[PDB]
Short mmCIF file of C-alpha atoms and ligand atoms in Angstrom, two decimals:
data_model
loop_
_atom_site.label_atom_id
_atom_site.label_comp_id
_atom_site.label_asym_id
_atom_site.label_seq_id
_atom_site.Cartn_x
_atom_site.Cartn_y
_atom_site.Cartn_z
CA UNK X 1 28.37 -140.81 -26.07
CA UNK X 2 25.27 -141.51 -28.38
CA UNK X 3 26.61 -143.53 -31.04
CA UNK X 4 25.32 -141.64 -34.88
CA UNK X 5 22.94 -144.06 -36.56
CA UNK X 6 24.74 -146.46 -39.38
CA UNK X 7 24.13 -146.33 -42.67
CA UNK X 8 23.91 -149.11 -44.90
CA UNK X 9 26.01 -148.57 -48.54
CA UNK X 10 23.43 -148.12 -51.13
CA UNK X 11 24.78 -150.74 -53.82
CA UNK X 12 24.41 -150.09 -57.40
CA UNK X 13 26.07 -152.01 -60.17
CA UNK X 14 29.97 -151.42 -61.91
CA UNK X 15 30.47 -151.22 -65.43
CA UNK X 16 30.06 -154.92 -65.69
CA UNK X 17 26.31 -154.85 -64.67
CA UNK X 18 27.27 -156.80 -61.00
CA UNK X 19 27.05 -156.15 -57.46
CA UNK X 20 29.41 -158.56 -55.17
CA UNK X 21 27.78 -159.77 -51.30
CA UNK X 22 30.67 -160.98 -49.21
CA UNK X 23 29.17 -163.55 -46.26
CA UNK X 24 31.07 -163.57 -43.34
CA UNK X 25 32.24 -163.01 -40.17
CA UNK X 26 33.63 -160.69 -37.74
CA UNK X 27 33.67 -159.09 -34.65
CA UNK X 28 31.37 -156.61 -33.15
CA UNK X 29 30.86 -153.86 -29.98
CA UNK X 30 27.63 -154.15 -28.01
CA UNK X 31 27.49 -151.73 -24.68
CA UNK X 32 31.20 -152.21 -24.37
CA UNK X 33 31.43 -156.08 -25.22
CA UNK X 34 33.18 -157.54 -28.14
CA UNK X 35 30.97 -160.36 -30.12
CA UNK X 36 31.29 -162.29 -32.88
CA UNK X 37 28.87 -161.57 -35.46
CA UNK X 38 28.21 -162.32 -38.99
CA UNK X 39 27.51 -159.80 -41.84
CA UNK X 40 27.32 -159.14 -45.74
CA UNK X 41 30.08 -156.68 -46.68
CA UNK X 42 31.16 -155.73 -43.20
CA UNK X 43 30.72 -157.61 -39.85
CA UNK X 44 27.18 -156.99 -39.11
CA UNK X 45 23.73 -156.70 -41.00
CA UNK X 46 24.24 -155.59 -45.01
CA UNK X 47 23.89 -153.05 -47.87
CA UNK X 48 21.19 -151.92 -49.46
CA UNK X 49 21.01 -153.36 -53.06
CA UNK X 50 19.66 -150.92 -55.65
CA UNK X 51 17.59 -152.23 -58.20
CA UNK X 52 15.75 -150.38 -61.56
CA UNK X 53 11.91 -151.81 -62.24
CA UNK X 54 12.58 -153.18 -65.67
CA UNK X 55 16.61 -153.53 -65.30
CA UNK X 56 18.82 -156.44 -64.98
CA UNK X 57 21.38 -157.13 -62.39
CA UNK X 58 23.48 -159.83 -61.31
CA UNK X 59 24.82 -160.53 -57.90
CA UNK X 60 27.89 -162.05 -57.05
CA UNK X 61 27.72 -163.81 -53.71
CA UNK X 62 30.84 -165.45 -52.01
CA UNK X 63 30.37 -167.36 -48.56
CA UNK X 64 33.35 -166.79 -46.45
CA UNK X 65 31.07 -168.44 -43.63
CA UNK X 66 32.51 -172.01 -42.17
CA UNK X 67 29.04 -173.39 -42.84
CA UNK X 68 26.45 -173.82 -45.68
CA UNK X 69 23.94 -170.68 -46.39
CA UNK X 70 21.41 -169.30 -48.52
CA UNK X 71 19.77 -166.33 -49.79
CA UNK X 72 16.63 -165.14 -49.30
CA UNK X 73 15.28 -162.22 -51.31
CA UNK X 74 12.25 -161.29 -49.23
CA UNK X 75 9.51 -159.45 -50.81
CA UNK X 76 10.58 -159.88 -54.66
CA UNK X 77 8.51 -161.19 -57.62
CA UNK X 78 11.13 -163.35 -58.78
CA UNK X 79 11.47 -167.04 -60.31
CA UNK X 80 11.67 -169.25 -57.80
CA UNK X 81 15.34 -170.21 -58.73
CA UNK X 82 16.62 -166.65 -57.72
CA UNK X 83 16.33 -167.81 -54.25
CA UNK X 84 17.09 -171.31 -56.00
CA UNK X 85 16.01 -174.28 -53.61
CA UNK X 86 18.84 -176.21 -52.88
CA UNK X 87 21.16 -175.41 -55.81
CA UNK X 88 20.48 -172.36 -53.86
CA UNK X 89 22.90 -173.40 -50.98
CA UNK X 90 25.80 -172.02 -51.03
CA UNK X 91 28.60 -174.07 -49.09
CA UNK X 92 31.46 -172.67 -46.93
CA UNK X 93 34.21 -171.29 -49.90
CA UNK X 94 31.28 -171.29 -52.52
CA UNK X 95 30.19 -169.10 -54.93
CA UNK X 96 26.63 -167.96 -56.00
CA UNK X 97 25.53 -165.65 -58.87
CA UNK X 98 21.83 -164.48 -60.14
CA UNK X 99 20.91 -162.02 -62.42
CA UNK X 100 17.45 -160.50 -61.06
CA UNK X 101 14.79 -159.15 -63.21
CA UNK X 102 12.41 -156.76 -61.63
CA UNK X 103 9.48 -156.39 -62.43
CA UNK X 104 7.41 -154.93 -59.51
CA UNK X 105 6.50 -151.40 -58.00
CA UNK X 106 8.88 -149.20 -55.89
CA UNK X 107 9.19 -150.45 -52.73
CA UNK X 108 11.69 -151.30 -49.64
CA UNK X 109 12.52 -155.02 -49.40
CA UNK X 110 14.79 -157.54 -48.01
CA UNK X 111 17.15 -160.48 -48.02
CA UNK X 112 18.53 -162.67 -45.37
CA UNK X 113 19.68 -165.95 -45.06
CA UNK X 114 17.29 -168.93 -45.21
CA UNK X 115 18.88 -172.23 -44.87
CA UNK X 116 16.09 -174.91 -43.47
CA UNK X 117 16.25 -175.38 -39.65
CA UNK X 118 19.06 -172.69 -39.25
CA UNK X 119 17.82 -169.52 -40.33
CA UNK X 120 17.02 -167.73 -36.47
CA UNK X 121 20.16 -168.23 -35.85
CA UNK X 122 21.77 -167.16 -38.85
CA UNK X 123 20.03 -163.94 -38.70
CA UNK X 124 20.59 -163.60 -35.09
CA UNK X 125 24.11 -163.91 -35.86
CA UNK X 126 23.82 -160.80 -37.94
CA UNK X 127 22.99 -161.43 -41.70
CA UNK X 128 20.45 -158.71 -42.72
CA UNK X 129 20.26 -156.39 -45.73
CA UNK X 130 17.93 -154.25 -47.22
CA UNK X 131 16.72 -154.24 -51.02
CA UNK X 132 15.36 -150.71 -52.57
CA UNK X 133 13.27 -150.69 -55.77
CA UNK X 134 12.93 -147.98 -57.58
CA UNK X 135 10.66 -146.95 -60.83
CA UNK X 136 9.59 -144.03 -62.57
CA UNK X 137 6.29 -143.21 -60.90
CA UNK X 138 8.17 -143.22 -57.22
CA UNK X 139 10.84 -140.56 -58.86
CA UNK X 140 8.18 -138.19 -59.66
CA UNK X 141 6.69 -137.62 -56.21
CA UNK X 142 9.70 -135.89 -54.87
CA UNK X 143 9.47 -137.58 -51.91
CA UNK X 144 13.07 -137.31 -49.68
CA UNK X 145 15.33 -138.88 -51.35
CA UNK X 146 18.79 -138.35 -50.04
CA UNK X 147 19.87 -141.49 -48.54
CA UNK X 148 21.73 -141.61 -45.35
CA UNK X 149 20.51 -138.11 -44.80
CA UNK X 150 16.91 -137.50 -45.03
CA UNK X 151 15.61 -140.77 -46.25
CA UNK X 152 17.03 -143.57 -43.97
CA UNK X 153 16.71 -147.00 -43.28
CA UNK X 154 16.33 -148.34 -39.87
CA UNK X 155 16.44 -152.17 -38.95
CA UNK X 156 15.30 -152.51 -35.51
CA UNK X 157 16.06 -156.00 -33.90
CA UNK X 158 16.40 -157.47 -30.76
CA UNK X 159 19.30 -159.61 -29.23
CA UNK X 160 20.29 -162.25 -26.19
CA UNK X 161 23.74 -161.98 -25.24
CA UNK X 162 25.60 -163.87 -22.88
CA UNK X 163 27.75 -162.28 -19.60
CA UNK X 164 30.87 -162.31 -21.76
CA UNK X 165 29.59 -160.31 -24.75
CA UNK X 166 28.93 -162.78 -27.24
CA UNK X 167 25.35 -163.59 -29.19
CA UNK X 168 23.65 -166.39 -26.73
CA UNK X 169 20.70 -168.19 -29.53
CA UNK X 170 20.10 -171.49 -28.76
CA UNK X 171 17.05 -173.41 -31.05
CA UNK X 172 15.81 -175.81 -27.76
CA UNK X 173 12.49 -176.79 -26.89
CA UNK X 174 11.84 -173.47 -25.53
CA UNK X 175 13.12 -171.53 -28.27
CA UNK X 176 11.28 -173.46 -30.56
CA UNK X 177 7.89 -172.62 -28.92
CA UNK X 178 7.88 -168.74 -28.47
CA UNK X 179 10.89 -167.70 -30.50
CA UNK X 180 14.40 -166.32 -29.94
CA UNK X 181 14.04 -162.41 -28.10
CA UNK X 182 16.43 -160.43 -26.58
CA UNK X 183 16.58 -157.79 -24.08
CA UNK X 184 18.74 -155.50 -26.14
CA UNK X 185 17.46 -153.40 -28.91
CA UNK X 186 19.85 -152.16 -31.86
CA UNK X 187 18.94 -149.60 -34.62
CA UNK X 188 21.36 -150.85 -37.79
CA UNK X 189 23.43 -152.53 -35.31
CA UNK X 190 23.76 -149.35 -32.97
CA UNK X 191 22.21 -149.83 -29.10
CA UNK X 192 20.31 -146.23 -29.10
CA UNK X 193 21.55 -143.95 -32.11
CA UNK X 194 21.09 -140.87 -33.00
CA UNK X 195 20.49 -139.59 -36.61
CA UNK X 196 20.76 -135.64 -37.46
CA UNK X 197 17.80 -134.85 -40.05
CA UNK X 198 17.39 -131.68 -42.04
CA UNK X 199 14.25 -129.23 -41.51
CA UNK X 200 10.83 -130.84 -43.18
CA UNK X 201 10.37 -133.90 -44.59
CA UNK X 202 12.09 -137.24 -42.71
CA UNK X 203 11.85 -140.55 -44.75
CA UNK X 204 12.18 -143.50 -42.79
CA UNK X 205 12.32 -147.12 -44.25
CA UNK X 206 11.20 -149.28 -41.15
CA UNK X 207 12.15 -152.88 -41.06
CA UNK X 208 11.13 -155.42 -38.27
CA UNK X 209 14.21 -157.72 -38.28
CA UNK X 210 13.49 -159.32 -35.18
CA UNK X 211 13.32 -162.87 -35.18
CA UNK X 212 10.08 -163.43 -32.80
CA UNK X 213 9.33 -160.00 -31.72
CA UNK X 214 6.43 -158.28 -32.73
CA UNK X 215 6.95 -153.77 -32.83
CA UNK X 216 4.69 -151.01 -32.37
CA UNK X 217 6.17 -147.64 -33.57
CA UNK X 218 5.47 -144.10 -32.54
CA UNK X 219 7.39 -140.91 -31.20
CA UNK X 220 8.75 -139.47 -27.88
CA UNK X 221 5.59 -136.63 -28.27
CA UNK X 222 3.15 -137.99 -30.31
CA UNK X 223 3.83 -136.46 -33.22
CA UNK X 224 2.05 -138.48 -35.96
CA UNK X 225 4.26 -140.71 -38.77
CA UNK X 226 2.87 -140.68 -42.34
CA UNK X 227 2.72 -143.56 -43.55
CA UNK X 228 3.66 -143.83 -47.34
CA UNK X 229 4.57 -147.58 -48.12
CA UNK X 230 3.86 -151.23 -46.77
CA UNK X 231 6.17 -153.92 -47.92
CA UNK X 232 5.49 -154.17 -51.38
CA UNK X 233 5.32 -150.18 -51.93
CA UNK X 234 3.45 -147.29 -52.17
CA UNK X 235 0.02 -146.77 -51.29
CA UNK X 236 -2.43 -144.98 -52.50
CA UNK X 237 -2.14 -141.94 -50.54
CA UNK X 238 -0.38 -141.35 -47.27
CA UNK X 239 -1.91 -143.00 -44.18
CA UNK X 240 -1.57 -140.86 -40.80
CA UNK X 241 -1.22 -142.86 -37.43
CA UNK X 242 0.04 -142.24 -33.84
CA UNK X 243 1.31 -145.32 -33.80
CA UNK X 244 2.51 -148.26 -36.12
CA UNK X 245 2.29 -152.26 -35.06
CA UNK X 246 5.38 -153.74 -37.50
CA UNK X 247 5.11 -157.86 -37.42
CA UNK X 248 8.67 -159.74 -37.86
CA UNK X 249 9.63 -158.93 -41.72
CA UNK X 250 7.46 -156.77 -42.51
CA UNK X 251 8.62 -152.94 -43.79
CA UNK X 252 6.56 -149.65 -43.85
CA UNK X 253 8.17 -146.31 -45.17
CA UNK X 254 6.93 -143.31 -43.31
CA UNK X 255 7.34 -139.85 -42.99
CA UNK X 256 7.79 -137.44 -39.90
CA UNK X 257 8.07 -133.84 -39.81
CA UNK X 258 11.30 -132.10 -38.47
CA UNK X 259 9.94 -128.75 -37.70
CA UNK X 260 11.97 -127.46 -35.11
CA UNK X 261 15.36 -127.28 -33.11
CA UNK X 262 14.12 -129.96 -30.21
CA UNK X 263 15.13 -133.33 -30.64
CA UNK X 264 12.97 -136.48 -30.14
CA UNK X 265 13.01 -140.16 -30.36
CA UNK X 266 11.46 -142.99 -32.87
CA UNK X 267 10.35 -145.18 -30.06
CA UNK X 268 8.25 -148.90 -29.45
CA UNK X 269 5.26 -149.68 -27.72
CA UNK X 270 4.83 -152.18 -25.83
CA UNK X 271 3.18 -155.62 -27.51
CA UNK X 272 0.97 -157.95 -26.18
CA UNK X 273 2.81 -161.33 -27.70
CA UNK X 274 0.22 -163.84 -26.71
CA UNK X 275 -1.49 -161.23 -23.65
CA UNK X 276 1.39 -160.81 -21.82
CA UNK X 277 4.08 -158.27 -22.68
CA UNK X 278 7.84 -158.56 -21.00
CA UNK X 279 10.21 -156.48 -19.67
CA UNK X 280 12.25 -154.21 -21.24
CA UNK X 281 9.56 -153.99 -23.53
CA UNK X 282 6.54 -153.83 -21.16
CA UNK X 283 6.86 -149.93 -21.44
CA UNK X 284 7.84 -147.43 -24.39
CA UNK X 285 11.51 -148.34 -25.52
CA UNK X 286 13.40 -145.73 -27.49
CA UNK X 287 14.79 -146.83 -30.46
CA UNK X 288 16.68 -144.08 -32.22
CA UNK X 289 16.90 -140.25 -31.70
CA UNK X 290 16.48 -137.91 -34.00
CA UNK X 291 18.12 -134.39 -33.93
CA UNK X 292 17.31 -131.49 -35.79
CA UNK X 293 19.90 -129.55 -37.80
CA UNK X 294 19.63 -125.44 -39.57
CA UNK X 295 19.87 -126.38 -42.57
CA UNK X 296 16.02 -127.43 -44.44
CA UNK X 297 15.13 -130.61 -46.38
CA UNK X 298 13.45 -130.46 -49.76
CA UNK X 299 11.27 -133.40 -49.74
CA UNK X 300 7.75 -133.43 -50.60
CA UNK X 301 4.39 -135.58 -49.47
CA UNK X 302 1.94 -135.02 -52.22
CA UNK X 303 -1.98 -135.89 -51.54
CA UNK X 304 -1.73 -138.70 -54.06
CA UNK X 305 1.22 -141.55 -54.25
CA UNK X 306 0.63 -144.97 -56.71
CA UNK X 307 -2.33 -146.19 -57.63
CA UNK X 308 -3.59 -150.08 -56.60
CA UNK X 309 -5.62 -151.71 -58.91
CA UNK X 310 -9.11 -152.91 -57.90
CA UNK X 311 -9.79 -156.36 -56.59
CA UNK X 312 -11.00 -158.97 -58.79
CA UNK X 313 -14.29 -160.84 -58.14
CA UNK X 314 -13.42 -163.44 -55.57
CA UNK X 315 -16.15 -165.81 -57.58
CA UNK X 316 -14.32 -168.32 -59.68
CA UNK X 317 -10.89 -168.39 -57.75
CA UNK X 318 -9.35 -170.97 -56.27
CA UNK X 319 -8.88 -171.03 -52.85
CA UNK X 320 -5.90 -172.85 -50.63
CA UNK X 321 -6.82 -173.65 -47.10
CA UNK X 322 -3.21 -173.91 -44.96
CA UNK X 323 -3.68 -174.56 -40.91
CA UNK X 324 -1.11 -173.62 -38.81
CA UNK X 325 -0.28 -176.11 -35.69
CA UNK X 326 1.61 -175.75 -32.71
CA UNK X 327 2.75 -178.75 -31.21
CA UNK X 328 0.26 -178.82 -27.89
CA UNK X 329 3.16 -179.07 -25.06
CA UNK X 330 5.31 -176.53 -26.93
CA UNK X 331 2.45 -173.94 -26.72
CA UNK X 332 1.94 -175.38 -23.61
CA UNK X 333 5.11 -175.03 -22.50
CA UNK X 334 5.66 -171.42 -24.01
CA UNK X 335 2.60 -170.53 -21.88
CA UNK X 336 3.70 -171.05 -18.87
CA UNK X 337 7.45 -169.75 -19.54
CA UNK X 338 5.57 -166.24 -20.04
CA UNK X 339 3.19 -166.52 -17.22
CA UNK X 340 6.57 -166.87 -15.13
CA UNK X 341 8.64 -163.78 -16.80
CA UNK X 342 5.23 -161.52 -17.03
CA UNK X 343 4.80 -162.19 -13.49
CA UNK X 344 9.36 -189.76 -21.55
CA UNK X 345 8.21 -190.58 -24.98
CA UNK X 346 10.35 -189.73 -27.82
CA UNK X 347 9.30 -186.04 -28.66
CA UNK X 348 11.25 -184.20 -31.72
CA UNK X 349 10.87 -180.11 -31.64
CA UNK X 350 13.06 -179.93 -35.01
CA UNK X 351 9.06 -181.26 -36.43
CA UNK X 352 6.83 -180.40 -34.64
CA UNK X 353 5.14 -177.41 -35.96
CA UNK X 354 3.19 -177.89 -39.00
CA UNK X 355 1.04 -176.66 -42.13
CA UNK X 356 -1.87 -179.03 -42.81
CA UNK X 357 -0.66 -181.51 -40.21
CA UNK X 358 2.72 -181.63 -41.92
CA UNK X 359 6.01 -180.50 -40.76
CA UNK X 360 8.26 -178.61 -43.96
CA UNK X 361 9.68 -181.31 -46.34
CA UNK X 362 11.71 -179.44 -48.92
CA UNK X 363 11.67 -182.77 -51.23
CA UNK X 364 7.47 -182.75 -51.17
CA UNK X 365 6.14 -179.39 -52.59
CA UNK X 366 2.54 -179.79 -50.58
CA UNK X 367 0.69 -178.40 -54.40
CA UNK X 368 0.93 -175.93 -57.28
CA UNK X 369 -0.32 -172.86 -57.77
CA UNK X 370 -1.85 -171.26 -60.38
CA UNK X 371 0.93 -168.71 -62.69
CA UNK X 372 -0.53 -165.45 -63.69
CA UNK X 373 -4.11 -166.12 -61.91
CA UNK X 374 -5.33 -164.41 -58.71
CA UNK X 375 -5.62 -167.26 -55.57
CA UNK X 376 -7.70 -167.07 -52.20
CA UNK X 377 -5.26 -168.46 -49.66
CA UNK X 378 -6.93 -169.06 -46.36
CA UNK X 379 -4.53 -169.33 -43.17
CA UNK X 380 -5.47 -170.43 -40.09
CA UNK X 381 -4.09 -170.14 -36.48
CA UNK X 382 -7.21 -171.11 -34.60
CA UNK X 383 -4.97 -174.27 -32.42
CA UNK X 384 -3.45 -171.08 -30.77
CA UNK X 385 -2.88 -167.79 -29.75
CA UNK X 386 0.44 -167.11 -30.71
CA UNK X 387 1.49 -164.89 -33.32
CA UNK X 388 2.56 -165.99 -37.13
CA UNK X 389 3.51 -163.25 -39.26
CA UNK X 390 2.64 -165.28 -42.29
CA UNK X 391 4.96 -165.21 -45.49
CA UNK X 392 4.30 -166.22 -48.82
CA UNK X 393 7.78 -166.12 -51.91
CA UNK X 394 7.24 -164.94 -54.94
CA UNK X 395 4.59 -162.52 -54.93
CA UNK X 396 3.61 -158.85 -53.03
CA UNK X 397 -0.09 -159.91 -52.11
CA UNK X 398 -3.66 -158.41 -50.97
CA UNK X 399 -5.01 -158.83 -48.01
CA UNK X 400 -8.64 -159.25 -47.64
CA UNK X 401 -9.12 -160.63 -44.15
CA UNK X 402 -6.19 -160.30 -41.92
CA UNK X 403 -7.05 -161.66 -38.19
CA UNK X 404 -10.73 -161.87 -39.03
CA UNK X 405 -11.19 -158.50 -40.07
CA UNK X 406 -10.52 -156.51 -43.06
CA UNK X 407 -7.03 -155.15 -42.96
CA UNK X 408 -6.14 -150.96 -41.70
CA UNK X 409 -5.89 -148.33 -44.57
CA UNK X 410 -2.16 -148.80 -44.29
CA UNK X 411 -2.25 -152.76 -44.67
CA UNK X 412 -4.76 -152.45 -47.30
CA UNK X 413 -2.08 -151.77 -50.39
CA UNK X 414 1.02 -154.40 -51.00
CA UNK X 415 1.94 -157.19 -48.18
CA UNK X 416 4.07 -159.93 -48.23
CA UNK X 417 3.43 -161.31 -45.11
CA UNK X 418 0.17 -161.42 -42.95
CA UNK X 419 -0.92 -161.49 -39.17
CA UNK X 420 -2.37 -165.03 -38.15
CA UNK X 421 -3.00 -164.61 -34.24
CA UNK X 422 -6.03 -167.44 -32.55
CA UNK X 423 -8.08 -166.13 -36.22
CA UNK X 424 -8.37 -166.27 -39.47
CA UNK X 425 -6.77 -164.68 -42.76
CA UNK X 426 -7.32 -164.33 -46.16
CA UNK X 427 -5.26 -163.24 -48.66
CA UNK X 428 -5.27 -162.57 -52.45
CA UNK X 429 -1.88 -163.55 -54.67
CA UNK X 430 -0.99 -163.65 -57.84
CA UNK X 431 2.68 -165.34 -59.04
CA UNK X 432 3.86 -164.08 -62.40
CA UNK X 433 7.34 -166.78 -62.07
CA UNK X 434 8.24 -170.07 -62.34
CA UNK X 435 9.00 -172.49 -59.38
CA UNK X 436 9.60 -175.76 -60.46
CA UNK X 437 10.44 -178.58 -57.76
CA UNK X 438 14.09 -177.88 -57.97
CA UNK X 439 13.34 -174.18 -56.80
CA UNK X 440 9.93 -174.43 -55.04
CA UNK X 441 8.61 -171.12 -53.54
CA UNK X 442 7.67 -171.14 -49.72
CA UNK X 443 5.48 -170.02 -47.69
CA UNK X 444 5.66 -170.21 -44.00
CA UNK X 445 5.27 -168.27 -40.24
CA UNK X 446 8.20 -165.67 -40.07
CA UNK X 447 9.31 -166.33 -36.35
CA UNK X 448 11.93 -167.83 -37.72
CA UNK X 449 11.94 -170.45 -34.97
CA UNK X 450 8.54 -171.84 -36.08
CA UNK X 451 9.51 -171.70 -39.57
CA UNK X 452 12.95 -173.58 -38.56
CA UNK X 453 10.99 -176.17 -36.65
CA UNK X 454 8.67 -177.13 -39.36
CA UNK X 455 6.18 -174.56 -40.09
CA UNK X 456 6.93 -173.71 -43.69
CA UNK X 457 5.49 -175.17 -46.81
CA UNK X 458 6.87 -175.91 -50.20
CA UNK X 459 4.96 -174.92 -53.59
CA UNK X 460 5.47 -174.69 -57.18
CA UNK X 461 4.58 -172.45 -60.13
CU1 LIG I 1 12.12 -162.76 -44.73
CU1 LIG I 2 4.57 -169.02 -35.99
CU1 LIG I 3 10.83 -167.17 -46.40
#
C-alpha cells in the first residue's frame, strides 16, 4: 500500500541539440482524491534537465496552460534574458525557446514558474522541476551515480486541499502575511513513498519546494546524512550532521549509508516558523522510506570533493544595503493567526511588502550591479521575525553573515538563497551575465507569497 517513490525523467538532448517542456494540466491522486494539478511533461512537478558545464542546449517550451507563465531557472549563472523579463512570458498556446550556456560547477538546481503576483500558486498547482549540472571534476569522484536508483531526487512540499480533493491556495490577506502551507506532505508528488536502495552509498538530491515552509531533515534512527553539496554544488569536503534545516528553494545533496536489511525513513523536524511550530509538523514527520535491497551499490565518498576559491578582501567592494518590510498589520495579523493554531481605510496586500520601502515594480530596476566584480549585499529583516529565504538571479553566491553569524560548514560553499529571520545577512556575489532592463535579474524573499505581494526587486547587469 506504500506507494514506490517517483522518479523524475532525466532529460538530455536529441540529435537536434533540444529538449521540449510541455506546461500543462491534468489530473492527480492524493490519499484517494482526484485533483487537478499542473505539471511539465506529465500532470504534476517535472523532469530533470541535464546539462554539460561548457555545452549548449536549447529548450523548447510550449504552454498548454489557459493562462500566461514563465520560467524560472533557479540557481543558474545565466543572462538575464534566459529567464527573459517579460518577453519571458509565455501566453496560453505560446511558444518559448532558449539555448542555455553553462558555465558553472556541478550542482542540483531548479526551475519553476515565476510570473509576478502568481507564482505560489502556480507552483502550488504543481509546476516544479529539477536541473542537474554536471562537469568533469564531479565525474571523477565516483560518487553514486545511478539515477532513479542510488542517486535520487526528492522534492518535498507541502499542500492545502479542500474536502473534495482538489488544491485549496488562495493569495488573501492572510496568505499574504505567513505564506501558503499545507497539512499534507508529498515526496515527488507521492504522500509517504518508499524508495528501494542498494547496499552502501545512497545519494539524495534534497529540494525544499514548499512555498512558505521551512524543513529540517534527519532519519528514523539517527543515522547521520553526509552532506556533499549546497545549492550551487560541491563543497569542499563532506559535511556530517544529524540533522539538516532546508529553507524554501534551497537544495543540499547528501549521502546516507544503507548498511543493512532494516528499513528506515528520511524524516522532518519540526520548525520553529516565527517561535511557534504547527501541527502536523509540531513533531517528526516522515517523509519517504527507504528499504534496503541484496544486491550492493558502488558509490564512493572520497575525503576531498571541489575546491572553493578563497574570499576576496571585502576592502574596496561595493556594498548594497536592501531592507526587507512587512506591512505592520499583516505581521500583525499573521501573529495572531499562529498564536491561535499553536495554541476601513483602503489597504492593498497585492503591495504591501517591500525592499527599501518599495513594493516590486518590474518597469523600475531599483540599480545596477557591477558585471564580473565581487558585491557586499547587506539584507535586512530587522521590522520582523518572520522568515525570508532570500534569493538573488544570476549568480551562486557566498555567504559571509547569514542571520548575524557566520554561516555552518555546510552553508559555507555555494548558496543561492540566504536566511533573513529578525537579523542581519551578508552576502558576497559576483554576476558574470548581462541583464539589461528588458531582462532584469531579481532578487527577492522566496515565500513565494511575500515575493508575490511585493517583496522582490529588479536589477540589471
Ligand atoms: Cu526559485
Ligand atoms: Cu519573506
Ligand atoms: Cu526568483
Amino acid at each position: 500500500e506504500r506507494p514506490t517513490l517517483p522518479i523524475p525523467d532525466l532529460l538530455t538532448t536529441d540529435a537536434r541539440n533540444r529538449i521540449q517542456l510541455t506546461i500543462g494540466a491534468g489530473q492527480s491522486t492524493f490519499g484517494g482524491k482526484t485533483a487537478t494539478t499542473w505539471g511539465y511533461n506529465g500532470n504534476l512537478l517535472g523532469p530533470a534537465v541535464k546539462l554539460q558545464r561548457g555545452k549548449a542546449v536549447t529548450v523548447d517550451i510550449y504552454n498548454q496552460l489557459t493562462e500566461e507563465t514563465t520560467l524560472h531557472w533557479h540557481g543558474l549563472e545565466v543572462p538575464g534574458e534566459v529567464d527573459g523579463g517579460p518577453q519571458g512570458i509565455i501566453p496560453p498556446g505560446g511558444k518559448r525557446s532558449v539555448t542555455l550556456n553553462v558555465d558553472q560547477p556541478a550542482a542540483t538546481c531548479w526551475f519553476h514558474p515565476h510570473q509576478h503576483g502568481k507564482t505560489g500558486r502556480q507552483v502550488a498547482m504543481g509546476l516544479a522541476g529539477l536541473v542537474v549540472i554536471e562537469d568533469d571534476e564531479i565525474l571523477k569522484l565516483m560518487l553514486p551515480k545511478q539515477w532513479g536508483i542510488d542517486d535520487v531526487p526528492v522534492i518535498v512540499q507541502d499542500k492545502k486541499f479542500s474536502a473534495d480533493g482538489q488544491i485549496d491556495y488562495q493569495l488573501d490577506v492572510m496568505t499574504a502575511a505567513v505564506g501558503w502551507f499545507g497539512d499534507t506532505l508529498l515526496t515527488n508528488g507521492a504522500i509517504y513513498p518508499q524508495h528501494a536502495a542498494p547496499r552502501g552509498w545512497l545519494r539524495l538530491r534534497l529540494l525544499n519546494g514548499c512555498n512558505a515552509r521551512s524543513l529540517n531533515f534527519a532519519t528514523s534512527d539517527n543515522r547521520p546524512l553526509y552532506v556533499i553539496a549546497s545549492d550551487g554544488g560541491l563543497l569542499p569536503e563532506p559535511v556530517k550532521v544529524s540533522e539538516l534545516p532546508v529553507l524554501m528553494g534551497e537544495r543540499f545533496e547528501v549521502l546516507v549509508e544503507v548498511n543493512d536489511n532494516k528499513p528506515f525513513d528520511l524524516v522532518t523536524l519540526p520548525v520553529s516558523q516565527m517561535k511557534m511550530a504547527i501541527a502536523p509538523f509540531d513533531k517528526p514527520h516522515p517523509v519517504m522510506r527507504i528499504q534496503p535491497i541484496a544486491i550492493s551499490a558502488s558509490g564512493a565518498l572520497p575525503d576531498t570533493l571541489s575546491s572553493l576559491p578563497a574570499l576576496p578582501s571585502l576592502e574596496g567592494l561595493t556594498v548594497r544595503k536592501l531592507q526587507l518590510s512587512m506591512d505592520p498589520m499583516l505581521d500583525m495579523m499573521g501573529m495572531q493567526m499562529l498564536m491561535e493554531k499553536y495554541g476601513g481605510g483602503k489597504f492593498d496586500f497585492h503591495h504591501a511588502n517591500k525592499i527599501n520601502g518599495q513594493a516590486f515594480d518590474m518597469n523600475k530596476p531599483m540599480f545596477a550591479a557591477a558585471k564580473g566584480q565581487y558585491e557586499r549585499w547587506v539584507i535586512s529583516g530587522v521590522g520582523d521575525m518572520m522568515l525570508h529565504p532570500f534569493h538573488i538571479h544570476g549568480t551562486q553566491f557566498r555567504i559571509l553573515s547569514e542571520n548575524g553569524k557566520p554561516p555552518a560548514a555546510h552553508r559555507a560553499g555555494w548558496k543561492d538563497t540566504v536566511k533573513v529571520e529578525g537579523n542581519v545577512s551578508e552576502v558576497l556575489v559576483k554576476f558574470n551575465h548581462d541583464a539589461p532592463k528588458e531582462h532584469a535579474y531579481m532578487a527577492h524573499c522566496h515565500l513565494l507569497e511575500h515575493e508575490d505581494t511585493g517583496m522582490m526587486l529588479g536589477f540589471t547587469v
